[model samples]
Target chain A: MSLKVNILGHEFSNPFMNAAGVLCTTEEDLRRMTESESGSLIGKSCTLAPRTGNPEPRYFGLPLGSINSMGLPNLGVDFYLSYAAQTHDYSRKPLFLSMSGLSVEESVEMVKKLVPITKEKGTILELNLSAPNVPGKPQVGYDFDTTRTYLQKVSEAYGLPFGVKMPPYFDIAHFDMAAAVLNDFPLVKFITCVNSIGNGLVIDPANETVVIKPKQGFGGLGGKYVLPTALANVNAFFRRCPDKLVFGCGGVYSGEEAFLHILAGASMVQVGTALHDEGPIIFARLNKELQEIMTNKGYKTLDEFRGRVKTM
Target chain B: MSLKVNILGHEFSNPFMNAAGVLCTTEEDLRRMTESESGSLIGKSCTLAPRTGNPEPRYFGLPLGSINSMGLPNLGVDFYLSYAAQTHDYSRKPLFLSMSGLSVEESVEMVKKLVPITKEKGTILELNLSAPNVPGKPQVGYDFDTTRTYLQKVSEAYGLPFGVKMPPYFDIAHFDMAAAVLNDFPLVKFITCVNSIGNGLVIDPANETVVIKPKQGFGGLGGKYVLPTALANVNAFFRRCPDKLVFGCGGVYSGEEAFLHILAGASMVQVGTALHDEGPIIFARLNKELQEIMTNKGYKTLDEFRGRVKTM
Candidate 1:
């Protein structure tokens, strides 16, 4: 049995990959990921210029999960574009370029310029619409009009298949609204179900202090703490936008979560906090776990159960 | 040291209460809560008439959390109103009437009729703007215009201090928009910062199927899974709508979670999944735990730190 999967006319050996903002920062990290077992790797979300991000103690891991206010720390788009131009290998594994421009205009400009460069390099583009820790910068994914407008601009400018990383939404009406916006832009081929549950605060019980330093210990939550939410979003968008593929993110730490995400209708699954905790080697374990589950279920391909969650 | 929390000129002896839709269904449950140690009790959300909710197996408990799609089961407004009219005692503790009318007109009629009855009985009114488990009914809290319209109609008809139980919002933009709508209604006294994170799916690995049956195993997530989102909503609204009191709900299984809720700016805290798991006896344990934390902090009152989450 083979673990081959297809997305946007390209085939992948497996459906497992590291989510943006985890192990996709430095050139070294990206190189390590490419040589690892993951089916794909995404670059860190970047703006027009490099950013220093939040101060120290901005990230912390707990038994249940992790909290991070890294504040979109990344090298400039030019840095990632240059790296992608020279090193991205389509024959090895697909590489996705993630961008979270500080403004809509910046996003549009980046989409226009970066698309050409990435296209030549045979890389994918994944637009990040949610970054919770940016001080004074509201996540565009929350505003329906803004999200639509930004998508419209990028879709028009780039006119290519792309992905969007979204924050988790707890409302059906929001799913309807967001789905409508996404459906309006057919070129938006895929939607990543979630980033992190934005702006969650974790307190250190012993010290009566918040865990992360940025935004006063308020940061994005990931890992097992977000598994249910991650599933909800994956399923919500899976059912809402039937035509658009959904990539599941948040809270996948093991084979069980990976299986649950696939059962929830994720075309592919992403690992964040788990990868951060275990390093690149975690990908091999995840792939094995997923394969084991698939074998136990007597399935050779993901299409059999993808998005088949039974509703009573 | 005192834990008194004052809202609408009424003071709660402590800041702990049961969230709507937990144990407040039958008169027996209501009576048990009143006799127990909880500072307040709220009736199950009611539409015009009684609802049997979804079929059995709609709820399941796990080590980390619980999921349910109860579908707003209750004996309707008339049953609850009659119970409140006869059994409510102002000297004991506050009782809140929660309404989740299926339609706008039904909600308006309920408000017009129930407000006067509750006013005489000194009971509180809580409008549930979010109930994620209802089969096809969308939560009103997600739509700003619909939420504003509903609140406007209810406030105009009732013209008294009431509260609105809101679903958790992930984006800062949602906090701003929801707060702007809430602030428009001066009579909307308190805002419950969350319901359960909606539409989560739980899988049973051994069975190779979902745990619950409603919406085909999709239900609301509670317990530890919701702690971070719950705190964010509590703090987000606490900072956004300074004029309105915010009640914390979701993920409070022990006193530690309750303390975190208050420290995160909740005027009062509500327990859901944990209450179901442990029964009403959980209240006393929670209060004792919260008081111990308060004592250790060298704080005499919740006022010392309410809405005081520090930002770097």
Candidate 2:
């Protein structure tokens, strides 16, 4: 029985990775993830410059999930690019640089500037098309035309096989529309199924107050609350865009969720809310449970069941 | 200190109601809801003719929630209209007629046909703009211009105080755009914040099979998974279109979620997945819990805390 997953001709020991902005904000966090059993790790989504992000109480943890409006808090692209350039452990695991430039032009510029370093380090690039907590900045993935324009510009500038992280789409037409836009750029190799259920308000009835401080208690929702939506988007993109790979994120705190993600057509899966709550050690538990489930089902390899959810 | 809510010059004893498509299909089901303690009840979304919907196994219940793609199955608009027309208890609670015509023209025709009956009986009309489970029909809410055009035609045909049930939107720009479109029709008095987290796939990893039959296991998701998104849509519209009341739907299994919905600016909250699993008796337990929570928090009324979420 093997859990190996291949993406863009590179093999990952497992299909588990950290969704950007969870445990990759600092070098220490990145190194810790690298040393762990995680199949891959990504840097924090970076802008052209650093960001302090939203105010305190920007993140709130609940029994079932978490809510955050951190507003793309990061140490900037230069730091991540340099970190990728210095890393000599390509054999250990793949490294991904997540970029979330504020605008299309800035995203193009960032892609242009990072091409050499990304190529030098043999690193992967994942352009974050959805960042809902950025106070005034709307997510690019919501606007079909804008998303196409941004992808076209970035693809032309980088000229490398890259990926995009998308927000959950609730409509069938949206899936068709977004797939049409994504198919235009063949170099966009993979699609991250979802970011978070954005702008959700978690309220504390006792104090009659919202949980988070950013955007007046408006933040991105994660964990069990987003699993179905996450699966929907993953499967939607998987079936619509036959040429692209999908990475599943959201509502994953255990092995069952991860296994479900693979069944829904995710080549790999990501942990965000769960990783934040339990630290990096959660990967070992997840892998163990995943293996147990697979063994119980007599599945010898992931490919046997990956994207094999049987319909009625 | 009363739980009374006034909308469109009618007063409801409480803000709890059954969401459309849940326990409101058959005449017997509608009668049960009407006799129950629910503040109000709505008929199933009806087309011009009766539909059997998808095949069996179209709905599946889970520990956390439910998945369904019932395909707008109903006994037709004439049945619901006659049911509403014959009702003699308008004083006890309000009744709403939900219309989900197969096309814009059909919807307009249905509205035109039902107007006199609804007016004579003092019943409300709700146009369902989001029904994701229908096999090949795209939800009108995804296309902003199309949604506007549909609403325009419907408003012109049926000039009365009514509402529109909306799908959850992930982007703030969508909220702005949808709210803009909604605000254009002054007669649109209320907006149901969400229908369901559409097109979610529920799977049984043990069997390697999907739970639902319709659309090849693609169905609308409900229960706790949708609470945050439900609240987000409710509050977004509440803030954007102050003139319109926002009704909360999705993710209410207990009093806590119901309380959370009201706190997030919903005038009335609808229950679906929970109602499906636990039966209509869940309302009494929810109401008791909601009252207990309110008492513990020293609030005698929902309006005291409704829409008053505190910021940093």
Candidate 3:
């Protein structure tokens, strides 16, 4: 039995990778992930310049999950883009570079800069459409017209295949609207099913206070707290866009959650919350569980059961 | 110290009540809730005609929460209307009568019938706007225009003050839109900030199948699983609509969660998953916790901290 997964005609040893912004904020963190058994490694979501992100205590851990409003802190696109050039020969595992620009114009500028570097390398670009709709500008995913505008601009700037990491869509109309926009872009090769359940508030009743230190104590939810939501979004887009691939993110700390994700139609799965909790070693542990599950099911490959979720 | 809560100019002994459709399906269920320590009781969301809901095995319990698509299975409007008239004289606890019509016309019809009976008693008409948007038709709360139409028609038909139970909104724009629509209707006295996180999918990996058997094994999420989401929705509307009282629902199992809900501006709190887990006795358990926290904090009344959540 094998856990190999292929997307856009390229194969990976396994279906696991780190979700952007968790354990990829610096060169040291990226190097460790590269040395680990992870099937692929994605860089932190970069902006035009390095950012300090949210304040301390911005991430608070709960029994079931964690809440974070890290404000997209990264070492700028220059660091990540240079690393992409330097690390291409280091390993067989692929690289995914993510960027979350502040506005449509900011995003267009980012892809324009990225196109030249990525042309010589096999790096796949990931546009995080769930970028926070801060003070002046709105997020792209939540607004359909904006989503169309952003995608149109990015596709025109970058000639290579790319993916979008989406925020979870709760309503049917929203799911239809978002998928309708994505289906229009042929350059959008794969879609990451979820980013995080954004703006979730965790309160510490004993302290009589909110947990996080940003956005009035609201942050993104992760871990088992979002498994069902992650699965639902993964499956929703899988059903909606048959021609494109769905990369599952959210709540994959163990191989079992990853198994469920693939069954829900995810071609590749990402590890985030648990990756932070357990560090890079979490990959080997999850891979063991995944292979065992594959062995138990007598399945030699992902194709046998991928997207075979039987609904009653 | 007192836990009394005020809404629409009426006072209750405490801020706790059972969320609609949990252990409130029959007269037997409603009677037990009345006899229990609950401050108020709400009936299962009734349809114009009776419903069988989804199917058996529609609800599956998890370690952290639950998934259910019970498909609005409740006795018809006639059953609930009759029960509302019969029960008002027997208890001092307030009653909230909830209805989920398939269409705006159906909701208007129910209000026309309810207008005559509620005039004799103090039953609060709670229009559950989060009514499942099924096949061909959409739900009221998800669509702002439909939400306006439903409230407008029901107001004209009922000619009395009513409340609405809303679906949990994830987007900042949606929260603004939904709260704006509710702000328009003067007859809307209060708003239940959230229903369950709908269409959540839970998988049983060991069993290699989905837990629930409805909507292709998709169901609404509840319990500690959704506590953060519950607080965010509660706080969002509380911040947006100061004129209306917010009755917090979704994922209240302990006094700790309830305390946070009140801090987030929930004037009243509702119990669901834990109520189902521990039966009606869960009220006494939660009350004990709430009071202890109140005693620890040296708070004398719910009004002092009801909307006093602190941000860092």
Candidate 4:
């Protein structure tokens, strides 16, 4: 039980994993993760067709963190499916096939194709409803009605255990509404929060110009800038979604933030900005740092400290 | 034309000022701010009765910033009125006598008392509607109905010009709804955002304990941790409420953030966490720093670049 996470009838070696769309896009990127010290592996969210995403200078890194408008560029869903088909062994760790279609109908179409692989292998389907960088598209996670409709259609298409990639919810009422929507659909066993605080504009200050060049230079925020908000959302959904596992993303640069996420009720902590900064080798560094903290705290298992955030 | 800001028929030497509840509660604290380099001075938010708020360890300073649950501790309304009477000089800079009643009726009662002063001396009434430290008391800014009711009753009580302090709004729909409410009340001419990202939990990772001692170890977040969010909220309302001025607060520790707020759309910028961290003397340093940025950017007047944040 040392740093091990047992959830949804699958066991990850540790709670450390890559947040989707990091280094999971192609076979080369994923091969590095497979050989690295990561606990579980998640694929890049893909659409039916490949997209080049937003133009260059779309991502900018800062001291506090980074801002990006990647726009969900990926090598199509079938490319990931072929990758998923080869990993039929499913012996070492868990696998999540993340999909973010341009539309819910297209997303359903792809999931229907993944039905055979999901049945053959226990591949968890992570539906991404919160991509903010795509031009002319609203984050479905913010629109509860679209979210509700997407879930209803996805549930009917698969009718089995799946998961969701959620955007950050800042209000108490929003947390309540999102959780209510998730609880109604039991197929979603794991919920990952969040997909950046959307539409954050970062100016160069020196040049006095916007950072990125998409959607009027607005992009999603990540890194140390987003830790407190990220933890708040993770803890919010964790307290609300008892039946579902909560995965924490955003602002996690080190073991301290990862440890904070676990304490805030996230079972698996997803690394984004840091992963992009340090590459796959960061898993080992974080893994060791996390263990050191646990050892000093006298916690022998993940469950011993997970969600044990002391209140007043 | 240098750094002065003209608003509500009053002119300030610069756009910098003390946010409510900073160093404005006590005569001695207000004295420090009055003698400081800040442009305008605002009084602490007071209620019907003098009362202490929360317990010890209510505020905790972090490396990046600080978190506080001060709980609105201050003297009675009569004390601020006396302070207001002494500031009748109104010639040098503007004076905002802020009031935060425990209830709408009580707030109205206090405002009715201030109406005599408002007529005699054009003291701008800054209504605080977003104090988040009070236990079991919901922020009036969150509930649109309560906000509407408060505006109706307060307008009836005074029927004069006033402004409101608002909590941070993270959702687009929330921003839209809040702006819609504020626009209906013509008497409310200025809006200050935001109070802080509320109910954020900060855990001391080494000690494995919560930072603050109130509301289940939860409090409002400020300082560098919340700069992006503060700027976002400021810009959102500035773009929405064309007629009302937006006073930006939260995460303003330096000229850089203050400049960002001005570029985003804030007319007047308030200092909170840094004011507490470095005391009132911090104002002079920030004042100089702001001038440095302005000089480097080749901007002579606030209007030259205010709300001129460039997009893609």
Candidate 5:
């Protein structure tokens, strides 16, 4: 009934966290989210430099979730260095540096570049593997072999606990892939369950065509509608990889979603698209409301329900 | 100056007012805004009853600002009664009804009906004669002749204090016409300066077509970019009718913008598009920050610098 969790041997106050890839490129946004009720903030996916990002129509709304094709669009490592350097002391909540890489070497390099900041600034390192927007990219943990290879490379290179972000496809093999990765390497540390699944399309009834301008006309979807899928994936990942740390991500919009993630065996849960719908106040409001829920439930910390699904 | 001012003859703790037509459609949104730093929450222009809004593409983006063509989609008077009834006691800040009418009789009747609610539930009113989204509609305050006639008739009908919402567009005739209304109706308590001017459209040279759909390919632009124009109009209105009450509004996104309005002869200021850009936290943040600015300027109350343009 209560959530308690430990990550990299460090105890957490709660499982609630801000998700990656949601335009959280600003230090102000990070400071606000971490200062709010959220236990941690996952920054936007970052690269080597300040990227202009993809062209217009990069974001499109789908039936339940929304799809985004805005290539990472981050200001790169230099930008994060300057920002992190300044606000390193401002936010009391633990900060998770969400790192993105175009290649294995690049990923490793990116992690090494950020390792100092994470170590000095008290930032957790979350490895983002399968972002749909970055074209010409391969899914990092699509199968057992791929998961082990990728996780081993990054984990060995970093020498610190890292989390893997996966895509949300319903293939049982995908779960098996995660299971294999966990079985092979308990050092893989953590896993962020599911990024945006395949191409999400929006049909413009005007011409019986698609609205997205990706030429092929499809994008990734994220929002209130995507919460169920995200939750289910978290459940599946936790069930499959009981030994590995897991983060329930996708469409977490409220404190209840955070609680749901804890019940699903997640060490932490993220708030995403809902931030787009509601705004920053959602952070403060959600944190206060969640703490109230925790206090009422007689839970003093975030680990009581870590990786423990009651209904199951 | 520590801002303290009166709106509609009612004292406000500060001069920060919520811009009309931003997000105060439901009573809940109103309560949220009021509880924040905003001195008042201006509702969306309410019609007779619930009405369907315009189809998709109701919004557009400009170079440095935003253009929106969301035709006033509201759940009319009866619906508002139920909504406002629920949130009447949520805050002490005044909830100003932004009443819109299809005709003179309709406007009068709308106010007549709303008066009972305001009286019973302690809400105020702001007559919206300013909306660029609804074309060919009777925007009572745009044309000086019709504006004066409209205000005269409305003021004669109800001695209750209310403000006139205006657009930025003006000719010599329009200013003269405002004088006529202000001179005739002592009960014309205040005037909200400037609404969206007209539709702003953008094109994608890459795609060889329009990017956004405004009504007739037009939408009213609002953002930090329009601050100069808004300030000019507000200053002009203040100069022409010194004794009249004025709530300077438009393009305000920060404490400096809010302060500029106070310096430009407005007893208070309202912000709308900022809500579209920022989140609900903008209000409370703006308020607290404005308080600090006012104190730093060495002024005790809002009136001391209410029209202190030279000082700024």
Candidate 6:
């Protein structure tokens, strides 16, 4: 099977891309993620205006997975612009800056800030609409009309081939509505699904209280636990719109598993969770494993099995 | 479904148990394991002669797992005898003491010392024939037919029902031969399928060094990595001998996973790595989850589903 894939006309060396919101809190981490052999990378989430975000004790280790409510901390528009300016010179990996904001105006403001830099450097933008770790938000991507309005405004302001980073909603019924919104935004080139499920915590038995607190110990879960759900959601989204570009993300550790997601429906795959366990070497190892699997499976390209598993 | 399971005519609330050789270094750790919802708790692997296990910096944490080669340091047989007396009296859960020896004579001597305690305290004896973390010996369980001879000799000497704790071996084809030898002895009561896979190390990339010294970064591999192999080995033994009593040991974090193993043929499931991650609460959580699953599935007891599956 061929490992290379394309998203929104941008070609990737392989389907395995680094998921948005990895530990790229600084220039060093960003450099590492981008330089690694990922198909692409979703840069750290930044808001329209600069914010320090949540306090310390933001992350905690649980028995099964991890919990964290970092509150979307980022280097802000100015820093991201600088990073975007260096995109070509710094790394060859495709870069997608993930923008987070409170209102549509804020979203537009953030996208506008990146427009100049993206035009100059030829970089892409990713609008994160549903961070379950944050609350009182309409889960902006879930509602069709609202999401359409938000994307339309952001697109009009930025005029770039951007994408929306969405959360994992339980219902398959939402797929059609979401796809319609994406379809309306011609500038919207891709969809990254899904975001962290968010809102899970583990308590400290010794203290009879929560282990760590910030947003009341609620954080999205990752790792082996989220595999089945993520796969199903990606397949559902693909079923709703066969021609749309879909980047599947959740509990992606090994290249074999990532290939499985690509076969299921994803045009590309994003790997997270496993980073915590195996570190950067995971990428090189996975690439090697994927190559071996592709050779053995008698396929030349990733498209050979993209959403090909059909039963009548 | 009933959560209750039977082993040697003893009814247990669930199939969950504390495997031998995981974090049972001190008395406090042992006490906590017994008090939890686990049906049984296997004590630390103690030697005939007391030795302070490995030196400091023995424990090291990798990204997904941990490694420790504490060389079975103990307070000697005398100290263990005194502690075992207290443990036997206080533990509400069934206690199975895991005993080891350097030589066959030493093993015999240790069993002689433990015989009276087992009879008086109504405890079970688990002969420790496998330990992968220790150096200089591979397949210690079958060295010189010592483990089998000793189990037979000790049972005859003490008139107590004992089991052999084997290490995680790739080819247990000789397991039948081992079992046949054990059956001939007529002293051995049941068998614990295997111990942790010895010494699987994960080297830190930044420094290019082994995180922990399991005989210098060579020790056992546990956790989810070993679950598939462990399950297959135990299932193989169970399949070979329908009437033989086998106790399953390996990776089990949730009760649902534990129930799956039991359904796959494990009479009782021993969990080690999960305890390192979940602590004592793991026992209660797993037991409760198992009960919930059993109640929801309309299965009254574990025996009905033992070795049963609805595979497509």
Query: Best candidate, TM-score-wise?
Result: 2
Q: Cα lDDT of model 6 overall? A: 0.66
In CAPRI terms, model 4 is classed as: acceptable
lDDT of 1 at A301: 85
Q: After superposition, how far is residue A10 of candidate 4 from its true place, in Å?
A: 1.2
Model 1: DockQ against the native? 0.58
Q: How far in Å is the alpha carbon of B202 misplaced in model 6? A: 29
Q: How do the candidates rank by TM-score, highest first?
A: 2, 3, 1, 4, 6, 5
Best by lDDT: 2
DockQ of structure 6? 0.01
Clashing pairs in 2: A223-A251
lDDT of 6 by residue, B1-312 (tens): 456766765767677778776756578877787667777777777887777776566666544445566677766666667667765544366677788876667777887888777666766788877765556655565443656666666776667667778754332324445556666655566667657545443334223344554444444556654454455456555666566677877667786667756765788889877788778788878877877877766667777667663321
Error (Å) of candidate 2 at residue A37 is 1.0
Residue A248 alpha-carbon offset, candidate 1, angstroms: 1.5
Better of 4 and 6 by lDDT: 4
- Name the TM-score of candidate 6: 0.51
Report the lDDT tens digits of candidate 1 across residue range A123-189: 8899899988898788888888989888989888888889899988776667778888889888888
**Per-residue C-alpha lDDT of model 3 across residues A66-154, encoded as one tens digit per residue:** 88888888888888989888754435788899999987788888888888777767788999988552433345688888889989999
Better of 5 and 6 by lDDT: 6
lDDT of 2 by residue, B1-312 (tens): 567788777888888899999999898898888888789999999999899898888888877778888998899888898888885378779998899998998999899987888678778998999989887798898888999888899999998888999988877888889988999999899999888888887778778788887776788888877777898898888899998888999889888888888888899989988888878888788878888888888888888988876767
Q: Per-prediction interface RMSD?
A: 2.0, 1.3, 1.8, 2.4, 24.9, 19.9
Interface RMSD of 2: 1.3
Looking at candidate 1 chain A, the ten consecutive residues that score lowest on lDDT are A203-212
Give the per-residue lDDT of model 5 (tens digit) for A1-312: 434346665555556666786637877776666666555667788887677777777776543446567778887876776666566543365667777777677777877776787677666777776766555554554435655666778778787766777766333333455576666765567778757644433444223244556524445667643444465567666677767777877656666666666666677777666776666667666666666766776667666544444320
Give the Cα lDDT of each candidate: 0.85, 0.87, 0.84, 0.84, 0.64, 0.66
- TM-scores for every predicted model: 0.95, 0.97, 0.96, 0.91, 0.48, 0.51
Model 3 per-residue lDDT tens digits across residues B1-312: 788876666778888999998989998899899988988889999989998877678888888878887778888999999988875544568888899998888888888988877777778888988754243344568888888999889888998989999887766777778888989888898889778787778877766678877666767788877788889888988888888878898788788888899999988899988898899999888889999988889888888788888887
Better of 3 and 4 by TM-score: 3
- In model 3, what is the error at residue B76, expressed in angstroms? 1.5
Two-way lDDT contest, 1 vs 4, winner = 1
